[PDB]
Structure formats: C-alpha cells, structure tokens
C-alpha cells in the first residue's frame, strides 16, 4: 500500500518487460543455438492489487467488476449477461480523459463517464479471476448466510447486533458437536 516505493522499485522491471515483447532470443541449447519469442500474461495478482495498480479505486466502490463495467446496484437486477470489456490501453486513455476533463462535466458525472478509473495505470495485466480467493470469499459468504439463517430473520428482520453474535457462537458450538471442528476466523483453505 505504500505506493511510492513500490512504483520506484518495480518500474525497471516493467520497463524491461515492455522492452522484450518485440524481439527474438538466441542462445546455445546443447549443441545448436536456438531462438525464442515471448508472450506475457501478468495474472497472479490477487484482487486488491489489481484494483490498486491498474487504476481502479479501492474495493468498496460502486463499479465492482474488474472486467466489465457495471454498478454494484446493477448486478442485483441483471445477473449474468456481461462480457469482458476492460483493456489496458483503454484505461490509459480513460485516465487521459479524466485528467483533461474535456466536456467540463462535474466530478460526479465524469466519474460516471470514466467508469471508476481515477489513477494512472501503472502496469499491464491480463484480466481474469483468481481461484483461491474466489473459493475463500464464497466460503465466507456461505458462513455468513448460515449465521443468518439460524437466526430465522426471513420472517422478522433487523434484530440487534448481539443475538447474531450469539447465533455465531451456537453455530460454531453445534458444528463442533457434529463435525468436530476447531474454531478459527482467518479462513484457511
């Protein structure tokens, strides 16, 4: 999260990475020398980092998908009909539109136009989904829905935020009584 030192260190590496995307490589491989080309796919960043270096805002935004461009509120109405529509150079030119402010729009309407981007893209990536944190987040969400559904709040909503801690206690105790589980919070794989 200390953005300064991270930029100032990693920028030689991204310089070299951009450099060797347009060449051949030649070296002796056991007898005859051979040649090489390259294609890179920066993928193994988690979710928070790729929200932090490609140029999006923090995690709690309204624009949520790092691939499509939809509001969080939009995903509640329409569920599954988008497509990937976020390149790297598109985020570069959108950053340019943000810094220039050509149409003299508001802060808010321009943020509505650029679809979230408010920093210079620092590095390239390919867009995709990390598997590990997908699994972990789904497990945490299902833990949440069980801690809800024991409290039977589908009939009556908005109880206190203490009985839910009680339901948390009884869920851990009962599942240790039926599956013999040690209690932890950092949800390991």
């Amino acid at each position: 999260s200390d953005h300064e030192t991270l930029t100032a260190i990693l920028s030689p590496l991204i310089a070299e990475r951009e450099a060797m995307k347009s060449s051949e490589l030649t070296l002796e491989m056991g007898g005859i020398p051979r040649t090489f080309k390259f294609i890179f796919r920066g993928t193994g960043y988690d979710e928070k980092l790729v929200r932090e270096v490609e140029g999006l805002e923090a995690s709690g935004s309204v624009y949520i998908c790092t691939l499509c461009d939809t509001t969080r509120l939009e995903a509640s109405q329409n569920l599954v009909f988008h497509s990937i529509t976020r390149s790297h150079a598109e985020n570069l030119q959108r950053y340019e539109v943000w810094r220039s402010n050509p149409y003299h729009e508001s802060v808010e309407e321009l943020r509505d136009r650029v679809k979230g981007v408010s920093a210079k893209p620092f590095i390239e990536t390919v867009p995709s989904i990390d598997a590990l944190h997908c699994d972990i987040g789904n497990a945490a969400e299902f833990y949440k829905i069980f801690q809800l559904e024991i409290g039977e709040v589908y009939k009556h909503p908005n109880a206190s935020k203490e009985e839910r801690k009680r339901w948390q206690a009884t869920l851990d105790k009962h599942l240790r009584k039926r599956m013999n589980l040690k209690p932890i919070m950092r949800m390991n794989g």
Binding site: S1, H3, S11, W98, S100, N101, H104, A119
Partner: protein
C-alpha cells in the same frame, strides 16, 4: 521566533515530505498528498485550516471546468499576482513519471468558507525545458509587463543513456535560464555564460524587476556553494535581455524555507549545512532597492526532539508563519511516523 507544537488530525497520512502550501486570500491550502487521491476527495487539494494548534483537513472541490491534476510532489510554485493565481510546473507524479506541463490555480466562488478552485492546464511552445523537479520558478515584472524566470533542477537521464541498471539515477539540468510568457505560454532558453555548475534546492526571491538566487546543492562535485547570484532580466518592446552578476557575502544552505516576514524583508529558516549537519541557525535578508543583505537572525528555540532528529521538511504558510515536519522516533516507538511544529515570525 515563537515555536509551538501542534496536534494532528485523524487523516495525518496525507502529509508527506515534498508537499505544497498555497495561500489564497489569507486562506491556506494544502496540495501534494502521498499516494493517489482516494475516493473520499478526488481532487487532492485540501483545506489546511488550523485552529488552536488543531487542524481539520477539510476537502476542497473544484470548478465545473478545471482539469483534475495529479499530486505533484516537488513542484515549482510562485505567486503570479496579476485576480490572484498560482503557477505549478514540474513536480513528480506518484508513479515516478515526470510531467512538464503547467497548472494555474485560481478561484471561482467563495460562499461562507466553502470554496471552489479553478485550475487550468497550460502547454508550452518553443524550446520547452526538460521535465524536472527541485527547480525554481519565479515571476518578474518590467516596463508594464511580466515574465517567468525558470532556473533548472535535477532530472532523469535522457532516453539514450537511461539504462535499466541505473534507471532511477539523476543528474542536473544544464544551467540555462528559461523565460516564459503566460499570455501565450511562449518559451525561450538562454545560455548564460557566468553560472556554470548545476544547482538544485536553491532559494529564489523576486523583487519586481530582479531575481536573487542563493544556496542550492550541486551534484557534480556534490557540494553546496557559499554564494549568491543576482539576475537582471529586462523587458524592452524589442527583445528581452538576460544578465547576471555574482555577489559576495553568501552562505551554503541546501533545501531551506523562505518567508516574507515583512515588506521587502525575508527570513530563511535552517536547512542542512553538511550531508549530515542539518542547519540550525536561521538567517534574515533585507532586500533593498539594488542592494541585498543577508544577516544572522536571532537563533530561535528548539526542542530536544528537533535538535536530536536527522531530517526535517516544511513550507511557508504565508504570513510570518512556516510549518515544519519531522519523521517519527525509533527509540520512542509509539508514534504515527511523524510529528509537527509551527514557527511564527510575528
């Protein structure tokens, strides 16, 4: 001379070394946060309002038509007092690119202490200077007109000798002088033959026809020269002319802080003497009609945390008032990494 300590706001993280304090209409303002502008305030410029040594960094929205500017971290700033406005050129983005464009800070409307700023992106034509930081701009008048003097500072290697093992290395700009028209943003360089060696983090004063430069940090020999130079520009209706003269009775200081303590009367607070010696004793300068006099100022009090620290930074709040910041304490571990102080000059 009156020091005082000062309490801290909750979002203290936005203060870093290399900031900028602009002073609009008796009303201070902060610029140059650390890290990109967060979603809580997308501009990056903040109300630096201070009351009873407690500051409350309120945000600041822009106009409807400004150009949203990234936090430049070591810009050149000056007071174009001709409808007050400020000038920003150079600086250093958080991705350690270096822009060279100019940004002009102005006001649109002030209604009950809620202000609207207005800043404009200004492009240059002609011999554009290399994008650099640590340098110094200043404005000057002559014969009913005004122009911008710009004295160079440190920058990256050019696009040939920049190598991926020495990528972040830095060398001085070639010590030339740039003159800039802001009616159209015209540029002109001039090769002055008296100033030879590079210089950065110097201190610049402008008195309406003439520009005075002292201090500064050479890199090539890595020393701080003990001199000062007077620059006379002139604006006839023909070509503008450049002229310089060294003047004796200077000091060696590096990255200090100036302030207008009185009408044609200024004070230089301490900086660094040697590469480990922070300069403690401050100075004052009487800037006369065609004379210039530096002098020993009355040695203001320090706390032990100041005189046993190792680095400070700060800037000029505007009215005999400077704001000063040091990092935290390693042997006194409980800290939010920074502590602050304020010096008045009454």
């Amino acid at each position: 001379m009156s020091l005082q300590m000062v309490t801290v706001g909750h979002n203290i993280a936005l203060i870093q070394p290399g900031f900028s304090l602009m002073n609009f209409d008796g009303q201070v303002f902060f610029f140059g946060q650390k890290g990109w502008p967060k979603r809580s305030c997308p501009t990056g410029v903040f109300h630096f309002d201070i009351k009873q040594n407690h500051l409350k960094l309120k945000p600041a929205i822009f106009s409807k038509d400004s150009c949203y500017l990234p936090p430049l971290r070591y810009p050149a700033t000056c007071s174009y007092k001709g409808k007050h406005q400020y000038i920003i050129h150079g600086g250093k983005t958080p991705n350690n690119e270096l822009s060279d464009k100019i940004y002009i800070m102005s006001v649109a409307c002030k209604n009950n202490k809620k202000v609207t700023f207005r800043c404009t992106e200004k492009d240059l034509v002609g011999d554009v200077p290399e994008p650099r930081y640590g340098h110094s701009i200043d404005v000057v008048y002559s014969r009913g007109k005004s122009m911008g003097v710009l004295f160079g500072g440190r920058s990256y290697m050019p696009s040939t000798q920049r190598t991926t093992e020495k990528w972040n290395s830095v060398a001085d700009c070639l010590p030339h002088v740039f003159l800039i028209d802001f009616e159209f943003g015209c540029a002109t360089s001039y090769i002055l033959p008296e100033l030879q060696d590079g210089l950065s983090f110097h201190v610049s004063i402008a008195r309406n026809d003439t520009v005075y430069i002292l201090g500064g940090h050479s890199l090539a020999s890595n020393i701080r020269p003990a001199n000062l130079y007077r620059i006379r520009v002139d604006l006839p209706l023909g070509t503008p002319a450049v002229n310089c003269t060294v003047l004796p009775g200077g000091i060696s200081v590096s990255s200090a802080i100036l302030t207008q303590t009185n009408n044609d009367e200024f004070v230089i607070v301490g900086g660094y003497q040697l590469e480990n010696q922070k300069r403690m004793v401050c100075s004052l300068v009487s800037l006369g009609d065609n004379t210039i006099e530096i002098s020993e100022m009355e040695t203001p009090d320090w706390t032990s945390d100041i005189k046993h620290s190792k680095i400070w930074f700060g800037s000029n709040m505007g009215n005999g008032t400077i704001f000063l910041g040091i990092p935290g304490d390693n042997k006194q571990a409980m800290s939010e990494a920074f502590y602050f102080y304020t010096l008045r000059c009454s």
